[PDB]
């Protein structure tokens, strides 16, 4: 209602452009202030879905007017066209529609600046005044664009107080990261020219350098703010270091002139009047432009030498209007070169997650979202399409080269005329050769430029990386931990799952990040991150493997969660083994820092009883709520899984995934605040489900919808992963998920048995029946009888472990319902009719499945492996004595009929 | 026995069967374009012509050599046969021995087999016997039919050549795309609309509507003088339909097998300083064409080297010359661009790398006298010519390169034992199939 009122019913000359909605708007208005009347004294929201119909091609106008509405769904659509004066629906938006800004800054009627994702605040030049008549749209516009002009504001302000001569320590608490790093970057790309002018490049070394230890000297005194500030600052210095020692490295001119070229280099015009299109960028002799779009503070990433020939490679690509496509394995760093391009070109990349039930439409309506914005496009997974949606916007794609490189202002796709932007651009990252992947067509593959990424320098990530959390020792701490990466790659047994790509390597980092804080800034807090990432997903020799080789190449409380944990696993009735306690520490200590876990082991192995136990000590230890939603994935389609669009009238229908995300993104109670929410997909790890979540589990955290909704992923949602075997999964779900491997069963059988007796028990004097039940499961016998229970044939092939369920079970069962008669007898008697009803139950549970020579075998040796009640073919009670089947049988004379 | 050998080769392989309509109007366009003979003479290059571009090159060798073999069976003696047959034994290895001397072209064809010289003696009788070539351009302006389809391998495609044929002819395109019912709504219209005033129309992929191509493309063919239609299909894809194969024409595009060959092509597809690094840049892209054949020693894996390649280094080098006016050519950029960006992104392996870079460092030297093959030199341009002499100077100097008999080892720079492993295997299958058709 107060979306249909925003949108029709408050703003003037707006319901004349479809008089007859205007007309089903008023009626419904009548019915609804009717039923709102009777209410403060079903068919009116059928009504309302009936009359949104006609509602798609306003929306689409609406659309058209501001082309960020593409990365939001209709709903939001309605929310944010009828925030006619509240002016707060639309700064929840701004994730969706920008990336990288969080919400806007307003002051009494105003807007004073906005907020980006990590905290930074940008200011603008001049406060934008909101009127009481304006819709969204133009503001949206001019606060688009005022975004633009503060930004270059901040850059042309640190650029001269560069030039100035005053130190970049001084300035880097004072602006936004972008324009410290622009203004930084192009006072580095002049300094080098003029030292290139000369043969001197030793003295702006030692210049560099000295500016490197000063910001690391001042990193540990700085806020957060500052601190991020500074460690991406530190990024780009360590870049230039690198480069200005390889320069001085450099024997001839020639060489060091062909290593320049090799390299980014970002000038500055100063005869252009334009503000916004004073900045290019160059590389090998290409010129690409600044946008000046609002980065923000991110995860910058380190300038390995496979990421400047990916960079060179897309400019060459983007320089004819053509596409970035990146094949290779999992884990090496494609997506991630894509954003840090557009990062560095100043421009939010718009990431899509390629999906087999994205059609043309669908694909279409991106590209046209996408080029009337002029966002950048990564089409990530593209092999995941299916081959005649891949070669049916091959079309689309060759008609938005042709319109960027000859200056077309509009181009045709999906029967509509819509504006070109020329500052659009796609690019592709896909992974050829793996199994249910689609191959593109030539005729595609010819208007993208391919770039083999396979091996990454993993040694120059983690010696910068380590540098920046300050390490004392750097070179040889990262040079060890790739060789034993290498090392324990080569030395474990190879299965399918141990990969040790650049994706575990930098959770090793992450680990050790927040773990200084306790073991120290040295080789103790690296070993500890290695044991705590690698050491869940190894079996049991290659567990000793490591071991070995840890010891080889490396010299060298958490009582609280320990004490939790065995609280929870009293509450829920299991035993705190040391296997058991083992998983539990893996679980804990691998998802404080990862949110995608896979939990790998046989049936029954004890997952589900692992992450349940963790949650109730992770609850029970921070005192938030939590949220369990169990999802069978191969149960559902995958239509009713993310969601399908009705190709009936063009809506979208929330799968129950996608449904579960908007629910705690939207927080409408405010419940989803302060608590942990687990998602768990209790099945098989089919790839045509699970890497349609790829931009979800990455670092990416996102969810491209097929209609263009953009759900971002909040820190506390993790997703759980709870399958038998990963014979199908691809690498690239692996590597992204921190995964737990059950190697053998975390549950003695006498620990199982006690677990599940109580359980019953609970679930049901009592305390000498439950007393005598106990000890009759002599776990001695037990033992032997299970032993014994291996030697017979079966059918529906089951181990042991598994069929306790049904005795326990059975025998409880039973005994409650014999507990009628159980008040006039000796203890003798009950003990005996006790043991053969477990007895029974025993060979009925383990040898059920078998035949009768073999039941009478199982049955003989449970006689001989337990004075007791002998137990036979045919033994049964009648209403409390011992009999046998042969005086149970009643005489039968069938009629002729 | 032509038409029964077609229809032996359209047993071999779906895309290659032949109908008697098109049989029948190349026999007509042989009186279109001792006489009797002469007549036969004529059937059999037209023929061979019209039919050879519907086939891949192993079956174009394949059919070149049994063609010359039916015709010189049919007018020369006896001996010149039991020749021809142990000659072809000892190229499938199943019999050995040395052809009966007699007149001259046995001799020449003796010395291209006994210097281990396979791919030589497979196109000699191409060399000998037919005169004539047709690539898609004669087969679009030589056929009286409305309808094209193009087959190809997966990983290359030939819609590049057909937007060059249809610039050439002063045409349009409407590059459309099967696969979903939008695009299939689309072409509908357009068909009709190219139809009624003309225009030509391309569809790709059409190996992925076959429910639509079976319906409306067979009942339309089947049922303006200045509309024509392509359509784009896979050799290793589904199976087209024959009524629809055998009513339109069939062109197969590969990759020129040669090398000059391949330069000439590059070289005509197109200061003076851009003229000889584009020249420089078609050798380089022959050369390396060339050498991704061999599988095994030639390269790590099968890597394809495309048009856009040559597109994007061509574009690179005129970037780099003209902003760099100063004539001091940075070579060790261009060198280190073209051997890691432009060429070596499809590239996956780091010998692969390395051979790329070494192909590179070769034929980018930027030195005066370069030896780019063992057999031809150029100079570097002068300072006092033009655009018109430049390229009428390196037409002249590849006018006159010959290739040898030797070109796939000597030229590429690699050991000679992997070479005849390659040509044996390919010289084997080919005369073991052409012995299997033979006989019959
Ligand atoms: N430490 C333990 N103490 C007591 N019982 C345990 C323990 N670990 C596992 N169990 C028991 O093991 C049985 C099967 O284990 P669990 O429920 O964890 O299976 P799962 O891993 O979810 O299996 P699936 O392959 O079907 O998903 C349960 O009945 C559970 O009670
Ligand atoms: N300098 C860097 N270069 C490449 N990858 C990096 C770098 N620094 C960190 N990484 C990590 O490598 C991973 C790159 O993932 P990526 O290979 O782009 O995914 P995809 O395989 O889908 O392209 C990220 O998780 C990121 O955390
Ligand atoms: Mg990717």
């Given at each position: 209602?107060?979306?249909?009122?925003?949108?029709?019913?408050?703003?003037?000359?707006?319901?004349?452009?479809?008089?007859?909605?205007?007309?089903?708007?008023?009626?419904?208005?009548?019915?609804?202030?009717?039923?709102?009347?009777?209410?403060?004294?079903?068919?009116?929201?059928?009504?309302?879905?009936?009359?949104?119909?006609?509602?798609?091609?306003?929306?689409?106008?609406?659309?058209?007017?501001?082309?960020?509405?593409?990365?939001?769904?209709?709903?939001?659509?309605?929310?944010?066209?009828?925030?006619?004066?509240?002016?707060?629906?639309?700064?929840?938006?701004?994730?969706?529609?920008?990336?990288?800004?969080?919400?806007?800054?307003?002051?009494?009627?105003?807007?004073?600046?906005?907020?980006?994702?990590?905290?930074?605040?940008?200011?603008?030049?001049?406060?934008?005044?909101?009127?009481?008549?304006?819709?969204?749209?133009?503001?949206?516009?001019?606060?688009?664009?005022?975004?633009?002009?503060?930004?270059?504001?901040?850059?042309?302000?640190?650029?001269?107080?560069?030039?100035?001569?005053?130190?970049?320590?001084?300035?880097?608490?004072?602006?936004?990261?972008?324009?410290?790093?622009?203004?930084?970057?192009?006072?580095?790309?002049?300094?080098?020219?003029?030292?290139?002018?000369?043969?001197?490049?030793?003295?702006?070394?030692?210049?560099?350098?000295?500016?490197?230890?000063?910001?690391?000297?001042?990193?540990?005194?700085?806020?957060?703010?500052?601190?991020?500030?500074?460690?991406?600052?530190?990024?780009?210095?360590?870049?230039?270091?690198?480069?200005?020692?390889?320069?001085?490295?450099?024997?001839?001119?020639?060489?060091?002139?062909?290593?320049?070229?090799?390299?980014?280099?970002?000038?500055?015009?100063?005869?252009?009047?334009?503000?916004?299109?004073?900045?290019?960028?160059?590389?090998?002799?290409?010129?690409?432009?600044?946008?000046?779009?609002?980065?923000?503070?991110?995860?910058?990433?380190?300038?390995?030498?496979?990421?400047?020939?990916?960079?060179?490679?897309?400019?060459?690509?983007?320089?004819?209007?053509?596409?970035?496509?990146?094949?290779?394995?999992?884990?090496?760093?494609?997506?991630?070169?894509?954003?840090?391009?557009?990062?560095?070109?100043?421009?939010?990349?718009?990431?899509?997650?390629?999906?087999?039930?994205?059609?043309?439409?669908?694909?279409?309506?991106?590209?046209?979202?996408?080029?009337?914005?002029?966002?950048?496009?990564?089409?990530?997974?593209?092999?995941?399409?299916?081959?005649?949606?891949?070669?049916?916007?091959?079309?689309?794609?060759?008609?938005?080269?042709?319109?960027?490189?000859?200056?077309?202002?509009?181009?045709?796709?999906?029967?509509?005329?819509?504006?070109?932007?020329?500052?659009?651009?796609?690019?592709?990252?896909?992974?050829?050769?793996?199994?249910?992947?689609?191959?593109?067509?030539?005729?595609?593959?010819?208007?993208?430029?391919?770039?083999?990424?396979?091996?990454?320098?993993?040694?120059?990530?983690?010696?910068?990386?380590?540098?920046?959390?300050?390490?004392?020792?750097?070179?040889?701490?990262?040079?060890?931990?790739?060789?034993?990466?290498?090392?324990?790659?080569?030395?474990?047994?190879?299965?399918?799952?141990?990969?040790?790509?650049?994706?575990?390597?930098?959770?090793?980092?992450?680990?050790?990040?927040?773990?200084?804080?306790?073991?120290?800034?040295?080789?103790?807090?690296?070993?500890?991150?290695?044991?705590?990432?690698?050491?869940?997903?190894?079996?049991?020799?290659?567990?000793?493997?490591?071991?070995?080789?840890?010891?080889?190449?490396?010299?060298?409380?958490?009582?609280?969660?320990?004490?939790?944990?065995?609280?929870?696993?009293?509450?829920?009735?299991?035993?705190?083994?040391?296997?058991?306690?083992?998983?539990?520490?893996?679980?804990?200590?691998?998802?404080?820092?990862?949110?995608?876990?896979?939990?790998?082991?046989?049936?029954?192995?004890?997952?589900?009883?692992?992450?349940?136990?963790?949650?109730?000590?992770?609850?029970?230890?921070?005192?938030?709520?939590?949220?369990?939603?169990?999802?069978?994935?191969?149960?559902?389609?995958?239509?009713?899984?993310?969601?399908?669009?009705?190709?009936?009238?063009?809506?979208?229908?929330?799968?129950?995934?996608?449904?579960?995300?908007?629910?705690?993104?939207?927080?409408?109670?405010?419940?989803?605040?302060?608590?942990?929410?687990?998602?768990?997909?209790?099945?098989?790890?089919?790839?045509?489900?699970?890497?349609?979540?790829?931009?979800?589990?990455?670092?990416?955290?996102?969810?491209?919808?097929?209609?263009?909704?953009?759900?971002?992923?909040?820190?506390?949602?993790?997703?759980?992963?709870?399958?038998?075997?990963?014979?199908?999964?691809?690498?690239?779900?692996?590597?992204?998920?921190?995964?737990?491997?059950?190697?053998?069963?975390?549950?003695?059988?006498?620990?199982?048995?006690?677990?599940?007796?109580?359980?019953?028990?609970?679930?049901?004097?009592?305390?000498?029946?439950?007393?005598?039940?106990?000890?009759?499961?002599?776990?001695?016998?037990?033992?032997?009888?299970?032993?014994?229970?291996?030697?017979?044939?079966?059918?529906?092939?089951?181990?042991?472990?598994?069929?306790?369920?049904?005795?326990?079970?059975?025998?409880?069962?039973?005994?409650?319902?014999?507990?009628?008669?159980?008040?006039?007898?000796?203890?003798?008697?009950?003990?005996?009719?006790?043991?053969?009803?477990?007895?029974?139950?025993?060979?009925?549970?383990?040898?059920?499945?078998?035949?009768?020579?073999?039941?009478?075998?199982?049955?003989?040796?449970?006689?001989?492996?337990?004075?007791?009640?002998?137990?036979?073919?045919?033994?049964?009670?009648?209403?409390?004595?011992?009999?046998?089947?042969?005086?149970?049988?009643?005489?039968?004379?069938?009629?002729?009929? | 026995?032509?038409?029964?050998?077609?229809?032996?080769?359209?047993?071999?392989?779906?895309?290659?069967?032949?109908?008697?309509?098109?049989?029948?109007?190349?026999?007509?366009?042989?009186?279109?374009?001792?006489?009797?003979?002469?007549?036969?003479?004529?059937?059999?290059?037209?023929?061979?012509?019209?039919?050879?571009?519907?086939?891949?090159?192993?079956?174009?060798?394949?059919?070149?050599?049994?063609?010359?073999?039916?015709?010189?069976?049919?007018?020369?003696?006896?001996?010149?046969?039991?020749?021809?047959?142990?000659?072809?034994?000892?190229?499938?290895?199943?019999?050995?021995?040395?052809?009966?001397?007699?007149?001259?072209?046995?001799?020449?064809?003796?010395?291209?087999?006994?210097?281990?010289?396979?791919?030589?003696?497979?196109?000699?009788?191409?060399?000998?016997?037919?005169?004539?070539?047709?690539?898609?351009?004669?087969?679009?302006?030589?056929?009286?039919?409305?309808?094209?389809?193009?087959?190809?391998?997966?990983?290359?495609?030939?819609?590049?050549?057909?937007?060059?044929?249809?610039?050439?002819?002063?045409?349009?395109?409407?590059?459309?795309?099967?696969?979903?019912?939008?695009?299939?709504?689309?072409?509908?219209?357009?068909?009709?609309?190219?139809?009624?005033?003309?225009?030509?129309?391309?569809?790709?992929?059409?190996?992925?509507?076959?429910?639509?191509?079976?319906?409306?493309?067979?009942?339309?063919?089947?049922?303006?003088?200045?509309?024509?239609?392509?359509?784009?299909?896979?050799?290793?894809?589904?199976?087209?339909?024959?009524?629809?194969?055998?009513?339109?024409?069939?062109?197969?595009?590969?990759?020129?097998?040669?090398?000059?060959?391949?330069?000439?092509?590059?070289?005509?597809?197109?200061?003076?300083?851009?003229?000889?690094?584009?020249?420089?840049?078609?050798?380089?892209?022959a050369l390396i064409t060339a050498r991704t054949r061999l599988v095994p020693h030639g390269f790590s894996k099968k890597y394809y080297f495309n048009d856009c390649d040559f597109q994007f280094a061509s574009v690179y080098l005129e970037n780099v010359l003209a902003t760099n006016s100063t004539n001091n050519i940075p070579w060790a950029q261009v060198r280190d661009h073209i051997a890691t960006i432009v060429y070596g992104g499809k590239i996956d392996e780091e010998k692969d790398l390395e051979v790329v870079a070494k192909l590179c460092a070769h034929v980018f030297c930027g030195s005066d006298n370069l030896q780019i093959v063992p057999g031809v030199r150029i100079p570097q341009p002068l300072l006092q010519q033009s655009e018109e002499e430049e390229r009428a100077r390196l037409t002249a100097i590849l006018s006159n390169?010959?290739?040898?008999?030797?070109?796939?080892?000597?030229?590429?720079?690699?050991?000679?034992?992997?070479?005849?492993?390659?040509?044996?295997?390919?010289?084997?299958?080919?005369?073991?199939?052409?012995?299997?058709?033979?006989?019959?």
């Open positions: 209602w107060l979306d249909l009122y925003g949108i029709l019913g408050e703003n003037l000359d707006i319901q004349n452009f479809l008089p007859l909605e205007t007309s089903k708007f008023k009626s419904l208005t009548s019915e609804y202030k009717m039923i709102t009347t009777r209410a403060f004294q079903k068919l009116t929201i059928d009504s309302l879905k009936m009359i949104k119909s006609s509602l798609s091609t306003f929306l689409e106008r609406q659309r058209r007017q501001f082309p960020r509405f593409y990365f939001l769904g209709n709903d939001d659509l309605l929310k944010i066209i009828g925030s006619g004066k509240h002016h707060d629906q639309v700064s929840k938006f701004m994730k969706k529609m920008f990336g990288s800004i969080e919400s806007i800054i307003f002051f009494e009627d105003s807007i004073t600046g906005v907020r980006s994702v990590e905290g930074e605040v940008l200011n603008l030049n001049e406060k934008i005044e909101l009127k009481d008549s304006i819709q969204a749209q133009e503001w949206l516009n001019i606060l688009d664009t005022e975004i633009k002009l503060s930004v270059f504001t901040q850059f042309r302000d640190c650029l001269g107080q560069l030039k100035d001569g005053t130190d970049i320590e001084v300035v880097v608490s004072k602006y936004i990261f972008q324009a410290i790093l622009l203004s930084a970057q192009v006072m580095w790309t002049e300094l080098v020219e003029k030292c290139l002018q000369t043969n001197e490049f030793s003295k702006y070394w030692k210049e560099v350098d000295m500016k490197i230890k000063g910001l690391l000297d001042k990193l540990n005194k700085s806020s957060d703010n500052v601190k991020k500030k500074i460690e991406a600052l530190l990024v780009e210095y360590l870049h230039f270091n690198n480069v200005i020692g390889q320069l001085k490295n450099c024997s001839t001119k020639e060489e060091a002139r062909l290593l320049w070229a090799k390299v980014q280099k970002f000038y500055q015009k100063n005869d252009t009047l334009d503000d916004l299109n004073s900045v290019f960028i160059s590389q090998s002799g290409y010129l690409l432009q600044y946008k000046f779009e609002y980065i923000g503070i991110p995860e910058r990433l380190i300038y390995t030498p496979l990421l400047l020939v990916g960079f060179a490679t897309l400019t060459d690509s983007l320089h004819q209007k053509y596409g970035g496509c990146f094949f290779g394995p999992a884990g090496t760093g494609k997506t991630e070169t894509v954003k840090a391009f557009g990062q560095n070109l100043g421009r939010v990349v718009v990431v899509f997650n390629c999906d087999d039930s994205f059609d043309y439409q669908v694909l279409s309506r991106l590209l046209v979202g996408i080029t009337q914005i002029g966002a950048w496009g990564c089409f990530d997974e593209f092999n995941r399409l299916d081959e005649k949606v891949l070669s049916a916007v091959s079309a689309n794609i060759q008609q938005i080269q042709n319109g960027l490189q000859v200056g077309k202002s509009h181009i045709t796709l999906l029967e509509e005329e819509t504006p070109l932007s020329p500052h659009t651009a796609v690019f592709i990252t896909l992974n050829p050769g793996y199994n249910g992947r689609s191959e593109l067509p030539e005729n595609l593959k010819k208007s993208f430029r391919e770039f083999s990424m396979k091996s990454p320098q993993s040694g120059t990530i983690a010696e910068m990386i380590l540098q920046i959390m300050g390490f004392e020792d750097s070179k040889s701490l990262a040079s060890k931990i790739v060789h034993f990466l290498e090392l324990l790659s080569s030395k474990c047994s190879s299965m399918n799952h141990y990969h040790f790509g650049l994706r575990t390597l930098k959770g090793v980092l992450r680990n050790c990040s927040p773990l200084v804080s306790e073991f120290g800034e040295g080789e103790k807090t690296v070993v500890e991150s290695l044991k705590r990432v690698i050491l869940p997903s190894l079996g049991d020799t290659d567990e000793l493997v490591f071991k070995d080789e840890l010891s080889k190449i490396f010299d060298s409380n958490s009582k609280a969660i320990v004490q939790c944990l065995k609280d929870a696993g009293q509450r829920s009735g299991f035993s705190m083994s040391e296997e058991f306690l083992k998983k539990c520490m893996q679980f804990y200590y691998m998802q404080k820092t990862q949110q995608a876990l896979i939990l790998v082991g046989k049936a029954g192995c004890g997952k589900t009883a692992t992450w349940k136990t963790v949650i109730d000590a992770m609850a029970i230890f921070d005192g938030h709520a939590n949220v369990v939603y169990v999802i069978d994935t191969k149960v559902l389609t995958k239509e009713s899984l993310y969601g399908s669009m009705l190709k009936a009238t063009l809506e979208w229908r929330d799968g129950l995934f996608t449904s579960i995300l908007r629910r705690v993104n939207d927080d409408i109670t405010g419940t989803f605040k302060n608590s942990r929410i687990w998602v768990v997909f209790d099945s098989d790890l089919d790839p045509e489900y699970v890497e349609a979540m790829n931009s979800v589990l990455d670092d990416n955290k996102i969810l491209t919808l097929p209609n263009g909704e953009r759900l971002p992923i909040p820190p506390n949602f993790r997703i759980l992963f709870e399958t038998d075997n990963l014979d199908h999964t691809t690498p690239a779900t692996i590597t992204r998920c921190g995964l737990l491997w059950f190697s053998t069963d975390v549950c003695s059988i006498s620990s199982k048995i006690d677990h599940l007796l109580n359980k019953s028990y609970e679930a049901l004097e009592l305390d000498k029946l439950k007393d005598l039940i106990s000890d009759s499961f002599d776990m001695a016998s037990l033992t032997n009888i299970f032993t014994c229970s291996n030697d017979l044939v079966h059918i529906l092939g089951v181990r042991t472990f598994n069929k306790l369920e049904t005795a326990v079970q059975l025998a409880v069962h039973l005994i409650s319902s014999y507990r009628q008669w159980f008040q006039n007898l000796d203890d003798k008697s009950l003990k005996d009719v006790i043991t053969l009803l477990i007895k029974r139950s025993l060979l009925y549970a383990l040898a059920g499945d078998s035949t009768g020579e073999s039941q009478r075998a199982f049955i003989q040796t449970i006689n001989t492996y337990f004075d007791s009640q002998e137990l036979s073919d045919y033994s049964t009670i009648v209403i409390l004595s011992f009999s046998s089947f042969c005086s149970e049988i009643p005489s039968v004379s069938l009629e002729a009929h | 026995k032509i038409f029964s050998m077609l229809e032996k080769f359209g047993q071999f392989h779906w895309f290659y069967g032949i109908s008697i309509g098109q049989f029948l109007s190349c026999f007509k366009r042989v009186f279109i374009k001792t006489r009797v003979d002469e007549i036969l003479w004529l059937l059999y290059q037209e023929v061979y012509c019209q039919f050879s571009t519907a086939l891949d090159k192993k079956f174009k060798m394949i059919m070149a050599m049994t063609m010359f073999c039916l015709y010189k069976f049919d007018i020369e003696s006896e001996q010149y046969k039991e020749a021809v047959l142990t000659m072809i034994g000892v190229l499938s290895e199943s019999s050995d021995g040395v052809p009966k001397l007699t007149n001259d072209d046995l001799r020449y064809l003796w010395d291209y087999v006994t210097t281990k010289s396979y791919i030589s003696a497979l196109n000699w009788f191409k060399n000998e016997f037919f005169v004539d070539e047709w690539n898609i351009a004669d087969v679009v302006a030589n056929s009286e039919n409305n309808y094209f389809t193009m087959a190809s391998e997966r990983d290359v495609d030939g819609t590049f050549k057909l937007i060059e044929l249809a610039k050439a002819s002063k045409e349009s395109l409407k590059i459309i795309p099967l696969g979903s019912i939008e695009n299939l709504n689309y072409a509908q219209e357009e068909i009709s609309k190219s139809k009624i005033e003309g225009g030509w129309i391309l569809l790709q992929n059409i190996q992925m509507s076959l429910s639509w191509v079976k319906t409306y493309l067979h009942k339309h063919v089947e049922e303006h003088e200045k509309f024509k239609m392509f359509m784009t299909c896979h050799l290793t894809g589904d199976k087209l339909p024959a009524p629809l194969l055998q009513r339109t024409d069939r062109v197969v595009y590969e990759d020129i097998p040669g090398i000059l060959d391949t330069v000439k092509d590059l070289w005509g597809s197109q200061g003076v300083w851009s003229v000889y690094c584009t020249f420089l840049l078609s050798w380089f892209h390169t010959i290739e040898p008999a030797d070109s796939l080892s000597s030229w590429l720079q690699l050991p000679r034992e992997s070479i005849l492993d390659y040509e044996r295997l390919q010289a084997k299958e080919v005369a073991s199939s052409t012995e299997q058709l033979l006989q019959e």
